[PDB]
Amino acid sequence: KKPHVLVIPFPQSGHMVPHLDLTHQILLRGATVTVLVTPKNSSYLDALRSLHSPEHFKTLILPFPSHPCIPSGVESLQQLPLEAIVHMFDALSRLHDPLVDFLSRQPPSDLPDAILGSSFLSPWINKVADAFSIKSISFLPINAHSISVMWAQEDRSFFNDLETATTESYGLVINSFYDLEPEFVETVKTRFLNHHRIWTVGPLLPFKSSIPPAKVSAWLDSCPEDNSVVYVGFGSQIRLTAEQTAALAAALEKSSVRFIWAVPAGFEERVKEKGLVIRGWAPQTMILEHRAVGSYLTHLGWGSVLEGMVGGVMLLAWPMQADHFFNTTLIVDKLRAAVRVGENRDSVPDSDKLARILAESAREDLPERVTLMKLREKAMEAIKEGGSSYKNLDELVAEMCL
Ligand SMILES: O=c1c(O)c(-c2ccc(O)c(O)c2)oc2cc(O)cc(O)c12
């Protein structure tokens, strides 16, 4: 009654983390999965390997194809700039043969009932899925507003093939909920999916280095009032530059509000202690869920959009690349549930007035937050039982057996 799924995550945070958050839901619903990864991408699957026994959860590690345009020993896009994705595509394209090989050396009672790979790797995964007559289901961590804008592009490339392949797969899973953007879910379903199969599953919630995760919780607890502090983070993988940061550090100081800000390193005077600074990894989910945070200053990634939404925080947009502008269009303009605080991928706001209206989001009852809360109620209803996404998780597992 339960399927065997072969998942193929795309090696970058934005794709990788929700992709695995999805494989948890597949397994929670009784499936057994095999995750194909590359040697240094194995750490990702550590937590998932713990929560599920070796009978139901299996790992297929293949050596990363060597590439002249990737520096040696790099296997994910955390490290390269975003413009270097097209070589990560060709590199992993070469993973095709070993997968084909591995699957052929298999008894047909071990061959999976469906492949759940990233849509970015659909071009060759779809070629595998056909050869072995397995259903290819694609995964994207972006909302359907972005997909509808992207697929409708006339010049799509170098993204064209993955968009065509995604359009030709069995169906497509995305990390959104239906009531948020039904117009665009149906756009994609009718206009860009040959078999009109689309599963909305979000918000894919996650399951459970410079400053420990516990000492930061004591810090936050040491702050009433509730929603006092602003969390400022652009994380993996968009990095800043030294002139831009001094504009932000200046904007942060003039505001006189408590903050946290995860990343000389810059600025040179850390010493004004209403806000804390974390080098490297930070426990974002726990920070944002915490009562004391009321605002997120984010590049407006979709994963951050849903994190911030679930965490019930004021969303301050500074879109820079990838889908950030599609999200800005949807969430700030079309939905008036955020507020745009930086213009451009290389914008600088004048620190002084940026400090002004960021502090005005320590009010914090700006009607942006009230708009986003009603959005969150609908997202929560979406994932709890009977909701669009929940029911979609069920039908997706159900359909892989077919
Ligand atoms: O929509 C996306 C997009 O346009 C690009 C992109 C943008 C500018 C470039 O110069 C480039 O090479 C790629 O990347 C992405 C990477 C993701 O993980 C998700 C996305 O949705 C996009």
UniProtKB/Swiss-Prot annotation:
Work out whether the entry's keyword set contains Cell membrane. no
Provide this UniProt record's keywords sorted from A to Z: Glycosyltransferase, Transferase
Q: In which tissues is it expressed?
A: Highly expressed in floral buds. Expressed in stems, leaves and flowers. Expressed at low levels in roots and siliques. Expressed on the adaxial side of cotyledons and emerging leaves, in trichomes, root columella cells, and the late elongation/early differentiation zone of roots.
Q: What is its EC number?
A: 2.4.1.-
The reply on keyword NADP is: no
| Known outcome of mutating residue 141 to A | Slight decrease in catalytic activity
Q: Please give the catalytic activity noted in the UniProt record.
A: quercitrin + UDP-beta-L-rhamnose = quercetin 3,7-bis-O-alpha-L-rhamnoside + UDP + H(+); quercetin 3-O-beta-D-glucoside + UDP-beta-L-rhamnose = quercetin 3-O-beta-D-glucoside-7-O-alpha-L-rhamnoside + UDP + H(+)
Which of this chain's residues are annotated to bind UDP?
Answer: 12, 236, 282, 299, 303-304, 307
- Which purpose does this protein serve, as stated in its record? Flavonol 7-O-rhamnosyltransferase that catalyzes the transfer of rhamnose from UDP-rhamnose to the 7-OH position of 3-O-glycosylated flavonols, such as kaempferol 3-O-rhamnoside, kaempferol 3-O-glucoside, quercetin 3-O-glucoside, quercetin 3-O-galactoside, quercetin 3-O-rhamnoside and isorhamnetin 3-O-glucoside. Is able to glycosylate the flavonols quercetin and kaempferol to yield quercetin 7-O-rhamnoside and kaempferol 7-O-rhamnoside. Shows a strict specificity for UDP-rhamnose as sugar donor. Does not act on 3-O-glycosylated anthocyanins.
Binding sites annotated in the UniProt record for UDP-beta-L-rhamnose: 12, 236, 282, 299, 303-304, 307
Please give the annotated consequence of changing residue 118 to A. Answer: No effect on catalytic activity
Name recorded for this polypeptide? Flavonol 7-O-rhamnosyltransferase
* Source organism, top-level taxon: Eukaryota
Biological pathway: Flavonoid metabolism
List the source organism. Answer: Arabidopsis thaliana (Mouse-ear cress)
